[PDB]
Structure 1
Amino acid sequence: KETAAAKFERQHMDSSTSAASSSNYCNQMMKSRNLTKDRCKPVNTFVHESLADVQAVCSQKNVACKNGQTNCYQSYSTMSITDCRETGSSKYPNCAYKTTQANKHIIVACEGNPYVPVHFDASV
Structure 2
Amino acid sequence: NSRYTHFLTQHYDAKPQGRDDRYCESIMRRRGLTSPCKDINTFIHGNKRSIKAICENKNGNPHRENLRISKSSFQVTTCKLHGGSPWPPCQYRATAGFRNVVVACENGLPVHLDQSAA
Structure 2 residue runs without a partner (length 5+): none
Deviation at 1:23, TM superposition (A): 2.7
Deviation at 1:21, TM superposition (A): 3.5
Deviation string, structure 1 residues 73-123 (Cα, Å, up to 9, x no partner): 1111111000001001655021111010011111011112xx111111044
Deviation string, structure 1 residues 34-81 (Cα, Å, up to 9, x no partner): 1113x11101000111111001111111011xxxxx321111111100
1:116 to 72, 96, 109: 109
- Give the count of matched residue pairs: 114
Q: Displaced runs of 4+ in structure 1, greater than 3 A?
A: 19-22
Percentage of identical aligned residues: 32
Asked if the contact 1:89–1:96 (Cα under 8 Å) also holds between the matched residues in 2, the reply is no
Structure 1 residue runs without a partner (length 5+): 65-69
Aligned partners of 1:15 and 1:110: how far apart in 2? 20
Question: Which residue is equivalent to 2:70?
Answer: 75
Q: Any idea what SS the aligned residue of 2:79 has?
A: strand
Question: Which residue is equivalent to 1:67?
Answer: none
Q: Any idea what SS the aligned residue of 2:98 has?
A: strand
Query: CA separation of 1:43/1:85 partners in 2, compared to 1, >3 Å: closer, same or farther?
Result: same
TM-score by length of 2: 0.87
Question: Which residue is equivalent to 1:28?
Answer: 26
Aligned partners of 2:78 and 2:93: how far apart in 1? 8
Question: Which residue is equivalent to 2:83?
Answer: 88
Asked if the contact 2:34–2:88 (Cα under 8 Å) also holds between the matched residues in 1, the reply is yes
Relative contact order higher in (CA < 8 Å, ≥ 6 apart):
2
What is the root-mean-square deviation of aligned Cα atoms in Å?
1.9
